[PDB]
């Protein structure tokens, strides 16, 4: 379980918009770990790995 640290606006290419304080489930990462594939209430798609952090 993760929480979003900052807003991120989707730039297409299967990226997902997230809002600060939103909850996220993490499915995995790309090859260099810079991108994270996540699921939120709004869908599923890629977000920056350091825009999120574990919670609990």
């Amino acid at each position: 379980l993760f929480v979003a640290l900052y807003d991120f606006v989707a730039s297409g290419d299967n990226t997902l918009s997230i809002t600060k304080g939103e909850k996220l489930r993490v499915l995995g990462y790309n090859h260099n770990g810079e991108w994270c594939e996540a699921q939120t209430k709004n869908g599923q798609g890629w977000v920056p790995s350091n825009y999120i952090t574990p919670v609990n």
Binding site: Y6, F8, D13, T15, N30, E34, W35, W46, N50, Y51
Partner: peptide, 10 residues
């Protein structure tokens, strides 16, 4: 996953 790198954190 996007081939570009993501924005740096604010």
């Amino acid at each position: 996953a996007p081939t570009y790198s993501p924005p740096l954190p604010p």
